[PDB]
Design a protein around this motif. Structure first.
Motif, mmCIF file in Angstrom:
data_model
loop_
_atom_site.group_PDB
_atom_site.id
_atom_site.type_symbol
_atom_site.label_atom_id
_atom_site.label_comp_id
_atom_site.label_asym_id
_atom_site.label_seq_id
_atom_site.Cartn_x
_atom_site.Cartn_y
_atom_site.Cartn_z
ATOM 1 N N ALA A 54 0.854 -1.381 0.038
ATOM 2 C CA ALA A 54 0.165 0.262 0.082
ATOM 3 C C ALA A 54 0.594 1.441 0.014
ATOM 4 N N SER A 55 2.237 1.218 0.560
ATOM 5 C CA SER A 55 2.909 2.567 0.550
ATOM 6 C C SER A 55 3.119 2.782 -1.047
ATOM 7 N N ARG A 56 3.162 2.442 -1.640
ATOM 8 C CA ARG A 56 3.420 2.582 -3.390
ATOM 9 C C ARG A 56 1.936 3.466 -3.984
ATOM 10 N N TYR A 57 1.235 3.437 -2.469
ATOM 11 C CA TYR A 57 0.433 4.623 -3.353
ATOM 12 C C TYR A 57 0.070 5.559 -2.235
ATOM 13 N N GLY A 58 0.968 6.043 -1.409
ATOM 14 C CA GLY A 58 0.614 6.535 -1.012
ATOM 15 C C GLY A 58 0.898 6.281 0.733
ATOM 16 N N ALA A 91 -5.530 4.696 -18.667
ATOM 17 C CA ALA A 91 -5.257 5.557 -18.121
ATOM 18 C C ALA A 91 -6.028 4.794 -16.518
ATOM 19 N N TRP A 126 -2.584 3.450 -14.940
ATOM 20 C CA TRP A 126 -1.970 4.734 -14.383
ATOM 21 C C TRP A 126 -2.582 4.410 -12.677
ATOM 22 N N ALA A 127 -3.480 4.712 -12.494
ATOM 23 C CA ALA A 127 -3.872 4.344 -11.357
ATOM 24 C C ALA A 127 -3.275 3.235 -10.772
ATOM 25 N N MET A 128 -3.576 2.299 -11.285
ATOM 26 C CA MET A 128 -2.826 1.181 -10.718
ATOM 27 C C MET A 128 -1.246 0.992 -10.021
ATOM 28 N N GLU A 129 -0.766 2.625 -10.855
ATOM 29 C CA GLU A 129 0.610 1.791 -11.034
ATOM 30 C C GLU A 129 0.981 0.435 -11.537
ATOM 31 N N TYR A 135 -4.420 -7.775 -13.717
ATOM 32 C CA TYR A 135 -5.611 -7.668 -12.840
ATOM 33 C C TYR A 135 -6.932 -7.978 -13.167
#
Ligand SMILES: Cc1cc2nc3c(=O)[nH]c(=O)nc-3n(C[C@H](O)[C@H](O)[C@H](O)COP(=O)(O)OP(=O)(O)OC[C@H]3O[C@@H](n4cnc5c(N)ncnc54)[C@H](O)[C@@H]3O)c2cc1C
Ligand SMILES: Cc1cc2nc3c(=O)[nH]c(=O)nc-3n(C[C@H](O)[C@H](O)[C@H](O)COP(=O)(O)OP(=O)(O)OC[C@H]3O[C@@H](n4cnc5c(N)ncnc54)[C@H](O)[C@@H]3O)c2cc1C
Ligand SMILES: NC(=O)c1ccc[n+]([C@@H]2O[C@H](COP(=O)([O-])OP(=O)(O)OC[C@H]3O[C@@H](n4cnc5c(N)ncnc54)[C@H](OP(=O)(O)O)[C@@H]3O)[C@@H](O)[C@H]2O)c1
Ligand SMILES: NC(=O)c1ccc[n+]([C@@H]2O[C@H](COP(=O)([O-])OP(=O)(O)OC[C@H]3O[C@@H](n4cnc5c(N)ncnc54)[C@H](OP(=O)(O)O)[C@@H]3O)[C@@H](O)[C@H]2O)c1
Lengths: 459, 459
Positions: free
Chosen positions: A63-67, A383, A386-389, A414
């Motif tokens: 989860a740290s990948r997303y902040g 797009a 992108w939200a998934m990185e 996914y």
């Protein structure tokens, strides 16, 4: 001795045959194991529940990948097992009583073998409990059973299969999974996401080799970075090491572990039926059936893992529907019967990343000398990616250059088993790639845009 | 004065028009705001990135449901904003440099108004910077702008819209969102999942009222249990309370909050064009276009939010494709032009639960006097729903009983925007519900099984 109008061996997909059309006939049901079959009790449904629970843990860990900084305080494995089988086990009891309490249906709960065909043309069936009875029609749905390598049986080590690994008391620290198949990949994802160190010991060079080589190659590289992959290795011996196990490999190496899981394939249960003694032909270890699911014996049908080339539930359900309809038809009225459709059989592997495929692979199309165009679209070029990185998810499309229709579809990423459904629809109904991409709207910025752009890139 | 063969107002979907076919002509591009349009900079792409980060936080927060006890230690909102716009902002600069550095294309960075049609039939355009130039063809892609209630403007309170709320420095403790639309629902899901207290103040009775009533009723009940929903209320006045704001409602009550978000709809930018002075018809606040995206002025096309009834990017892109093709055709050669297709336009709302819909609702079909069948299938009645422990997700299908074709599809639940794609495909290509349900395979136990079982149930 008893007499029945129809007998069914196996309560998996065969249980979905006795409709209200048989309410006026007498039926005999055989189930040596737990009622409901393999997929309900120790198959698809329990596994995919553990997969989802493992994916929640994997979301927390990365989860740290997303902040969002979070961490798992505890993995209540006991509550996960009790939650899953607390829902599944009562289904086996209520589904079993549904047949026992019916006066037209008799349930035998021991292994049932074929006997000599009676003089009057009816089939004799005998159980290991001593009972003997006759039936006019017979449906064979014995399914399959796990296959354990002979070297592991000779060692006498404590091992687990897909049938027993999900009800273990405590999660081990280190697990060794022997196999490179669908079961081996799915359980490796379950345990590693729940905090278990996973070791794969495969005899080949790729995981999930019976998939398109682009998928196997990329997935094996990803799996090797988060699981310890030992390729070109077989277990040759082993011994007990306390509660755990110690396994010797074919190169002299020894692996110490707390749990052994075998996932080296399954074999049909036809060889334990004495069916050839009753007139049913058996090639390899499977019952031979035609496009109407009819065997070589009059009035005897087969379905599911015992006969189908696909060991999949959605195929076994389709074959059970064909048997259900063709049982009420005359045995020689083949033109009024329904044909089993194996033209576009899909399959999914619930690993991380998820794999879903349908149709031909690139190499399979080349072997048939087809003029094909191939596009491999990345999740990260959409797009939603992108939200998934996302940096590894891909969608692979193969089309016939002449007609422009889809030949094969392979998704690794996914929501793979959900993204492939529009592609299954186009192939099953003959929709071209050009029509599918622009003859309909795609929601922006939803995830299926990766399938749209995969169709657009087919240049 | 300058002369151009084509002029485009707006760098959103209109920027996707100048291909290599216009490499031999001179073009003028107008962009009063930030380059790239609304969806790239402050629209679909940035919002859905924050949405995915919110789903990660909510998955961690509700992980105990599956047996994993975890907790969020910190939500680094500063790093989330820098990660999202660190990807988006350079695209606007490189995409703008790609157009300016082209010698055939000039980019004007001020608001462009229509002038009087020149004697030679060419259109005059003037910018607020004082420049004037002429163009033979003109493309209108001015998009839309947020609408603020007049009572909120009169109060003079510090408020935020979708254009500016995503670049806030710090996450607020309590937010009040005025509106009941797509934007209001999506941001309420984003902020509440990151730990913000969310209060909705809507003037209607349902959230997403322009959706099927089955979705509005069930989603509003779910949303009201996790957000503070104040129905039948309007903001009439307000004043500053330190860094926050205090809002008085139409019932005398006052609400104190740290941030105000307005999401009360958008209106086309056609009223800022002086288009009627140059021959372009304007009804309501929209540009009048036909099925060929032609306006009331010869050689002038329009696309996107400035003219379309659907304020959606995938619709604006389809209309931009029609303009791109019809520009190369003669203005009177309507038979060589392509027609804009608005049949079965889908849309999704990225909230929790997720909403995706296409076609007609049940009440709309009744208003048309159609004989319809309706089925509402629950996520929890599918093996994949068991792994999710879902107790609210539904998929609603409406078919005409006569033809057996899908009339509408409405999904509210996990992966709603992904599951709706097979239904969009069947509707767009005229596939009946019976064909879609049993004329193809569905992967077991994947998520699209909820759509399969929904199709079977339309008794
Ligand atoms: C771990 C695992 C995960 C799987 N996941 C998936 C998945 O995600 N998707 C998918 O499509 N497939 C999956 N499968 C495959 C799926 O289990 C089979 O394809 C399907 O269940 C076949 O059904 P069946 O009724 O033919 O077999 P079964 O369900 O095994 O039916 C046979 C039953 O009859 C009993 N029986 C056998 N012989 C006799 C006899 N002589 N007398 C009496 N009773 C007898 C057996 O004990 C058993 O209970 C999975 C399998 C496993 C092991
Ligand atoms: C918060 C938000 C979320 C959204 N989410 C989605 C979603 O999930 N899915 C979806 O399909 N749609 C979504 N939309 C809608 C989508 O953004 C629009 O429908 C789409 O961008 C339309 O493209 P357009 O080029 O017509 O508008 P724009 O991209 O806004 O193009 C107009 C541009 O031209 C400029 N301009 C206007 N007038 C002039 C002038 N006179 N001179 C010079 N320049 C001018 C504007 O400043 C702007 O840059 C969302 C919108 C918002 C606000
Ligand atoms: N979600 C799903 O659809 C799903 C899930 C689970 C299972 N299934 C199905 O269930 C069936 C059985 O699954 P499975 O994973 O047990 O088998 P599988 O998918 O057929 O793969 C079994 C693998 O075992 C390996 N193997 C065999 N003997 C070995 C040995 N002695 N040493 C090392 N490796 C050995 C083989 O690797 P090599 O090929 O390199 O020899 C083989 O690929 C298949 O039909 C599978 O598709 C489907
Ligand atoms: N994913 C997507 O597809 C997506 C995402 C975002 C936006 N969009 C689109 O982009 C646009 C964004 O519009 P939006 O979300 O801001 O609003 P909207 O969805 O168009 O509607 C907002 C609602 O607010 C209410 N409202 C209107 N005026 C009001 C006022 N003065 N005071 C209080 N409430 C008032 C009305 O509810 P009632 O109708 O009940 O009166 C109105 O319908 C829309 O076209 C939307 O569909 C699409």
């Amino acid at each position: 001795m008893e007499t029945y109008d129809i007998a069914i061996i196996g309560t998996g997909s065969g249980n979905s045959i006795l409709d209200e059309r048989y309410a006026s006939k007498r039926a005999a049901i055989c189930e040596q194991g737990t009622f409901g079959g393999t997929c309900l009790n120790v198959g698809c449904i329990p596994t995919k529940m553990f997969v989802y629970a493992a994916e929640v843990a994997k979301t927390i860990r990365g989860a740290s990948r997303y902040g969002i900084d979070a961490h798992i305080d505890r993995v209540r494995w006991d509550d996960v097992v009790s939650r899953v089988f607390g829902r599944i086990d009562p289904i086996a009891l209520s589904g079993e009583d549904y047949r026992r309490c019916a006066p037209n249906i008799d349930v035998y709960r021991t292994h049932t073998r074929f006997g000599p065909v009676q003089a009057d043309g009816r089939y004799l069936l005998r159980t290991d409990a001593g009972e003997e009875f006759t039936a006019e029609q017979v449906v064979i749905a014995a399914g399959s059973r796990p296959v354990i390598p002979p070297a592991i049986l000779a060692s006498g080590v404590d091992y687990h299969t897909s049938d027993t690994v999900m009800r273990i008391a405590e999660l081990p620290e280190h697990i060794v999974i022997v196999g490179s198949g669908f079961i081996a990949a799915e359980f490796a994802h379950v345990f590693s996401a729940l905090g278990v160190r996973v070791t794969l010991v495969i005899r080949g060079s790729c995981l999930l080799r019976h998939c398109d080589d682009t998928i196997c190659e990329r997935f094996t590289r990803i799996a090797s970075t988060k699981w310890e992959l030992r390729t070109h290795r077989n277990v040759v011996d082993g011994q007990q090491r306390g509660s755990g196990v110690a396994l010797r490999l074919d190169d002299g190496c020894t692996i110490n572990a707390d749990l052994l899981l075998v996932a080296t394939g399954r074999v049909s249960n036809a060889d334990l039926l004495d069916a050839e003694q009753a007139g049913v032909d058996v090639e390899d270890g499977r019952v031979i059936v035609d496009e109407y699911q009819r065997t070589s014996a009059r009035g005897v049908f087969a379905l599911g893992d015992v006969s189908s080339p696909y060991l999949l539930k959605h195929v076994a359900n389709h074959e059970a529907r064909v048997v259900q309809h063709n049982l009420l038809c005359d045995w020689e009225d083949t033109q009024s019967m329904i044909v089993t459709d194996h033209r576009y059989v899909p399959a999914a592997v619930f690993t991380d990343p998820q794999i879903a495929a349908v149709g031909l692979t690139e190499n399979q199309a080349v072997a048939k000398g087809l003029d094909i165009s191939v596009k491999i679209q990345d999740y990260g070029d959409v797009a939603y990616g992108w939200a998934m990185e996302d940096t590894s998810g891909i969608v692979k499309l193969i089309t016939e250059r002449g007609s422009g229709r889809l030949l094969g579809a392979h998704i690794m990423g996914y929501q793979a088993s959900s993204l492939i459904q529009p592609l299954i629809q186009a192939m099953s109904f003959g929709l071209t790639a050009a029509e599918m991409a622009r003859g309909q709207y795609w929601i922006h910025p939803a995830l299926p845009e990766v399938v749209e752009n995969a169709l657009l890139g087919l240049r």
